[PDB]
Design an enzyme around this catalytic site. Structure first.
Site, mmCIF file in Angstrom:
data_model
loop_
_atom_site.group_PDB
_atom_site.id
_atom_site.type_symbol
_atom_site.label_atom_id
_atom_site.label_comp_id
_atom_site.label_asym_id
_atom_site.label_seq_id
_atom_site.Cartn_x
_atom_site.Cartn_y
_atom_site.Cartn_z
ATOM 1 N N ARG A 144 -79.760 37.249 -23.553
ATOM 2 C CA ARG A 144 -78.759 36.590 -24.411
ATOM 3 C C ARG A 144 -79.210 36.033 -25.591
ATOM 4 O O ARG A 144 -79.674 34.811 -25.240
ATOM 5 C CB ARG A 144 -77.644 36.248 -23.934
ATOM 6 C CG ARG A 144 -77.025 36.972 -22.522
ATOM 7 C CD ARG A 144 -75.807 38.477 -23.165
ATOM 8 N NE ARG A 144 -75.399 39.466 -22.499
ATOM 9 C CZ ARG A 144 -76.155 40.521 -21.986
ATOM 10 N NH1 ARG A 144 -77.065 40.823 -22.600
ATOM 11 N NH2 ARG A 144 -75.339 41.343 -21.111
ATOM 12 N N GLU A 192 -73.040 13.148 -46.877
ATOM 13 C CA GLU A 192 -73.264 14.264 -46.090
ATOM 14 C C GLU A 192 -72.333 15.540 -46.520
ATOM 15 O O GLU A 192 -72.407 16.421 -46.044
ATOM 16 C CB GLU A 192 -72.805 14.106 -44.581
ATOM 17 C CG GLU A 192 -73.380 12.588 -43.913
ATOM 18 C CD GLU A 192 -73.186 12.913 -42.623
ATOM 19 O OE1 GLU A 192 -72.639 13.553 -41.846
ATOM 20 O OE2 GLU A 192 -74.007 11.720 -42.158
#
Ligand code: FAD
Ligand code: FAD
Ligand code: MG
Ligand code: MG
Ligand code: MG
Ligand code: MG
Lengths: 204, 204
Positions: free
Chosen positions: A45, A156
């Site tokens: 997965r 940011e």
């Protein structure tokens, strides 16, 4: 009642880094017991690894108000009318940090808010078929009259607008689809199911 | 009230696929309007692209019961006591398919359930800071006395066990953290807020 199998019933053979950047994507290779009594073969997965988050529902129990933060989420673009979303205060938990310390830090950075008492809401897996991300939600006591303006850390590229609404107004926005991100839906549904007792607890 | 900016206020410069396998990781490059005026510089975000899902809460209004499906979700391993989760019927939407078509097909494949009426619950973004995934939940009318056994497509290594419990038990498992995946939390909180009217609507 309950689930059937435990970690004794699965072996993760290996994990392979498929992509390493700001986040990671890892191929988990594993075998596990089957409900019919056998063992699976090797299953793989692809799992999006992006850490885990703390989420704060800022609730003013005196005024029965909720503080929301608005910011762009580009990933919302393809399926939403606008990528600007109304959300909960939230951020990533770094190594050695507590959920509650992250919640308080983000409340200050994202909404200019001090937090008083807190209680856990719920901790949930965002989408566990493809990502490991867990988000732990708290409700935090706030004075919503102090919540206003433009926040976020510009360094940011975090640009955030505070909105204050009544609890009932926020919940109607959930029912109308105007708030449709998991963290906010879960938190505000929880609030609609617990507000009587919570307001009592925090105004006695 | 409401959000401030629309799609006219963001420019997606490019998307770059950084990884493609079963799923994809895309780098979105964009600039967007700022709340205090002006435009941001170029921002990039890594976004996990895995398509979108339909989710079905199977509710028996005669019995006030829900059908849960149990299967392993290996991504839950690192933050959960067991990676086997109790979840809603759910599957990916392929091109041309409707939410309702997928929900009805998956209910048969995953739980052996015929579905009567359906109604929308909510459609949510799982974690829009890092993934585009949207999941659209319906509630579906079922006869929970018909729900039992092991299902899932063995050819996709999908091994699923059916559980029937009272609505109250399922909701208490949300409160206790025994059900803690977003789709099930959102669906079962919704049910706890709407079940009285829903049972009246569906047993007329
Ligand atoms: C098929 O019904 C689509 O549903 P799903 O993939 O969401 O459900 P699931 O049963 O979770 O997935 C359907 C199939 O898609 C594939 N798949 C799902 N998740 C992953 C993953 N993280 N990595 C690789 N393959 C996956 C598997 O073959 C799985 O059997
Ligand atoms: O804390 P958080 O990154 O989850 O919150 P957010 O405000 O989502 O992110 C905080 C910072 O982490 C970085 N970040 C968050 N999500 C992504 C992403 N998908 N790709 C790249 N950087 C990201 C950004 O610099 C953002 O300013
Ligand atoms: Mg944030
Ligand atoms: Mg932040
Ligand atoms: Mg499924
Ligand atoms: Mg399936």
């Amino acid at each position: 009642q309950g689930i059937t199998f435990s970690k004794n019933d699965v072996e993760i053979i290996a994990r392979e880094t498929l992509y390493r950047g700001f986040f990671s994507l890892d191929l988990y290779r594993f075998r596990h017991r089957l409900f019919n009594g056998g063992m699976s073969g090797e299953i793989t997965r692809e799992i999006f690894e992006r850490g885990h988050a703390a989420v704060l529902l800022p609730f003013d129990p005196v005024r029965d108000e909720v503080v929301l933060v608005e910011q762009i989420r580009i990933a919302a673009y393809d399926t939403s009318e606008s990528p600007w979303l109304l959300e909960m205060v939230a951020g990533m938990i770094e190594a050695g940090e507590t959920v509650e310390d992250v919640a308080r830090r983000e409340a200050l950075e994202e909404a200019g808010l001090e937090v008083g008492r807190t209680k856990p809401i719920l901790s949930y897996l965002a989408s566990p078929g493809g990502t490991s991300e867990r988000l732990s939600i708290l409700v935090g006591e706030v004075d919503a009259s102090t919540a206003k303006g433009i926040h976020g850390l510009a360094e940011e590229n975090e640009d955030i607008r505070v909105h204050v609404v009544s609890r009932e107004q926020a919940y109607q926005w959930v029912e109308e689809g105007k708030i449709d991100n998991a963290a906010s839906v879960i938190a505000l549904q929880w609030l609609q199911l617990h507000y009587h007792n919570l307001r009592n607890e925090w105004t006695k």
